Amino acid sequence: GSSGSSGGSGHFRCDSSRWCHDNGVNYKIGEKWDRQGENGQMMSCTCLGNGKGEFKCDPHEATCYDDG
């Protein structure tokens, strides 16, 4: 099915339209911060916006081979 969980309306109308929130921190569209991963390593997130303040996170590593 769908609509299983529910809770948390929007009574107030703050001025947060171009900001993001993860661990109680205001990030600017494009900015980047550090966080924890599913396993344990650290993950880097980059604020995108596309609305309220969407964002993504990808694992950083030096898995780049050399050419020549």
Side-chain angles (χ1 to χ4, degrees), residues 17-65:
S17 37
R18 296 153 153 193
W19 309 77
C20 311
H21 163 96
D22 167 43
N23 208 50
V25 178
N26 49 93
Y27 313 104
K28 272 192 273 159
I29 300 165
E31 273 194 324
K32 306 89 154 271
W33 57 96
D34 315 338
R35 59 150 304 173
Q36 181 185 46
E38 304 179 316
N39 44 89
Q41 63 204 100
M42 70 157 262
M43 300 199 72
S44 286
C45 302
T46 303
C47 191
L48 302 162
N50 323 297
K52 62 176 201 173
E54 201 55 275
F55 59 76
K56 70 200 283 272
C57 312
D58 59 50
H60 275 229
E61 184 166 286
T63 185
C64 201
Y65 316 86

